[PDB]
Design an enzyme around this catalytic site. Structure first.
Site, mmCIF file in Angstrom:
data_model
loop_
_atom_site.group_PDB
_atom_site.id
_atom_site.type_symbol
_atom_site.label_atom_id
_atom_site.label_comp_id
_atom_site.label_asym_id
_atom_site.label_seq_id
_atom_site.Cartn_x
_atom_site.Cartn_y
_atom_site.Cartn_z
ATOM 1 N N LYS A 36 -1.033 -5.951 -1.805
ATOM 2 C CA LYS A 36 -2.186 -5.186 -1.322
ATOM 3 C C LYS A 36 -2.221 -3.858 -2.080
ATOM 4 C CE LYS A 36 -4.025 -2.448 2.247
ATOM 5 N NZ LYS A 36 -3.992 -1.507 1.097
ATOM 6 N N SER B 138 0.826 -1.210 0.000
ATOM 7 C CA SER B 138 0.000 0.000 0.000
ATOM 8 C C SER B 138 0.863 1.264 0.000
ATOM 9 C CB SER B 138 -0.971 -0.006 1.187
ATOM 10 O OG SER B 138 -2.069 0.858 0.949
ATOM 11 N N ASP C 210 10.080 -0.822 -12.508
ATOM 12 C CA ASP C 210 9.649 -0.775 -13.902
ATOM 13 C C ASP C 210 10.423 0.264 -14.699
ATOM 14 O OD1 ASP C 210 7.884 -2.606 -12.925
ATOM 15 O OD2 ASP C 210 6.104 -1.349 -13.156
#
Lengths: 357, 341, 35
Positions: free
Chosen positions: A275, A250, A261
């Site tokens: 989550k 989160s 990425d």
């Protein structure tokens, strides 16, 4: 007018039940049951509960995995860490009442309340054949979250983010400014329950110049927000080495996921607790409202966090590496192998930088 | 109208949820949620039961996931959890999920031979698929072990006891008995009780309050009894224990039982759908209910081993201490009977 | 630490080989970022 199927079932329940329950009680059980049946993180707030919703706690961040209540990560400054609560365990009872089926909202209500109020929790652990009862006293202790510590005989810092609270971006920027000679970061996000999204993109904004950071997308074309990096990234070239662990989620995977990425860091550790979701409290009636997830955030690539998580580039587990004062001593590095490996990934980054210089 | 509260919520979910869910899909989620919230035992039935055994891996051993009620193989006599040796002359040491389902499951009404090795049986028993009385050695007390409250159990118990006219005490074992038909359970308790109330089903209506009373056809009124119960006994097994305890016709020995005094009346509601709810609960002769406080045995004793220095061997008694206590409570019953005689 | 070709079998046996593979993974990431 598809309520015919629900009308038929409710017509025979209210007629042939052992107790005397009015239609109002039955319908409330249907609304609450349906919300708990969509997914885990949904809850219903009644007349009394909604009014009182708008300090202190044990610091336990809770979340459901495979239909069983589990603890994501206890914050360092809260008594939960001191008592002995560890990530990955299953919560069985609290205040002698069972934890068969509730939501996050009411479970948080049980923990939260007046400070200095004792709470008893029964926890089932994989390594423990018998559940253990813990007594924890509450407090309002406030502790700094993000602090930078230079590592001895190395040019690499060590930035530990205990929680993604407010002003984390400013503290990180000032901490990196206090060491202009630094040539590395060990972005420790181990055991970080989460925090605010508006600040998570702010922290990662210091490192990424061009490219989307994260995108929230529901089932509707509108409301599909997308966060993008600005051109004022100051540290687009300084090496990073992020550390993650199964107690991170989160926006502990927005910072780690966006860097991974964009190839801005080397995620090191174990798999994170998957989550990723956004929950809101849309009002439905005069004083009744539902808490229903609508959109998740997908990593710069476009893949999702819920519930795969972040797979680190280098996978290791806590332990002692084999051997034969406001700084990170060589001793404290040796206890946990995950911290030593993070420096190792920083050394290789420096060598490649010098070779390509 | 009355659906105002639900209509507003169901529209918001259909409009602002993560996924796109049809009203038909959301209706089933609401229906199944309502029954679960009503009671733990109640459950909504999709395609009910009119419309067979799965084996999975747990801790490196094969476990049964869910047994189907409609499979005739369940009534054949195949017991799960046994150390399976051979299935149709196939080695069970290394099998896959697809191999298991294709081998152990086949077209019914066809002979299939399985080799199973049981711990208590010195030799493996070969089973082909197309509630017993045992005298205790050196003691005049029988051992009426009721594994399950199936049909004809009352007739089997009565007939078996008639084969031992020299009976002087019964260790009525109801440990680990999920239950069964009430009409048979009352028939079993009617053997030992001459008069009084056995049970009573009650709901929210004055009518349909069923009440069961013993008749005068009890043959074994004066025969000593020592019922054994534990946490694995439910419903009809607690019916016998409570009915005897309230009538002082037996001595309940063991641990506390899990209350299962309810009736799950299956009933269709649509073309191919049905619901299952509790409609009647069982109240023992006194009046108090079985759910969910259970039965408190007179002599509470947890499982363990006794301290060291066709029939029931003395060695077999030593393994479980509850059986030894039940025989001890029968010995005291014999002495008190003799003293007053 | 625990939770013809080089299978992960002997990679776990000795830690020096594992560190060398992790050092190569970091090299690839820096190459991609600078590319």
């Amino acid at each position: 007018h598809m309520f015919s199927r629900f009308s038929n079932v409710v017509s025979e329940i209210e007629k042939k039940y052992v107790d005397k329950i009015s239609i109002s009680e039955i319908m409330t059980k249907a609304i609450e049951g349906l919300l708990s049946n969509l997914d885990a993180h949904s809850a219903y707030l009644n007349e009394k509960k909604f009014k009182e919703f708008q300090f202190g706690g044990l610091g336990i961040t809770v979340g459901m995995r495979d239909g069983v209540l589990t603890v994501i990560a206890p914050l360092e400054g809260t008594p939960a860490y001191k008592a002995g609560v560890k990530s990955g365990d299953n919560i069985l009872k609290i205040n002698n009442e069972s934890t068969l089926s509730m939501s996050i909202d009411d479970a948080i209500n049980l923990m939260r309340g007046k400070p200095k109020t004792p709470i008893q929790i029964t926890i089932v652990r994989k390594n423990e054949p018998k559940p253990l009862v813990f007594n924890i006293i509450r407090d309002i202790i406030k502790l700094p979250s993000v602090y930078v510590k230079k590592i001895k005989e190395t040019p690499y810092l060590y930035v530990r983010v205990s929680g993604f609270d407010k002003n984390v971006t400013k503290s990180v920027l000032e901490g990196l400014k206090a060491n202009p000679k630094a040539k590395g970061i060990v972005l420790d996000l181990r055991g970080n329950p989460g925090g605010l999204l508006n600040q998570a993109v702010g922290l990662s904004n210091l490192f990424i110049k061009e490219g989307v950071l994260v995108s929230q997308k529901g089932k509707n074309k509108e409301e599909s927000l997308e966060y993008k990096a600005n051109g004022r990234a100051p540290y687009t070239n300084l090496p990073i080495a992020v550390l993650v662990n199964g107690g991170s989620a989160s926006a502990s995977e927005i910072v780690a996921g966006a860097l991974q990425d964009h190839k801005r860091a080397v995620i090191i550790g174990e798999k994170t607790f998957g989550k990723g979701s956004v929950q809101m409290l849309l009002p439905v009636n005069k004083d009744e409202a539902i808490k229903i997830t609508t959109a998740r955030y997908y990593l710069p690539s476009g893949r999702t966090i819920q519930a795969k998580g972040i797979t680190p580039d280098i996978v290791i587990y806590p332990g002692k590496v084999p051997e034969n004062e406001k700084e990170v001593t060589p001793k404290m590095i040796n206890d946990d192998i995950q911290l030593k490996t993070a420096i190792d990934s920083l050394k290789t980054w420096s060598i490649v930088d010098e070779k390509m210089d």
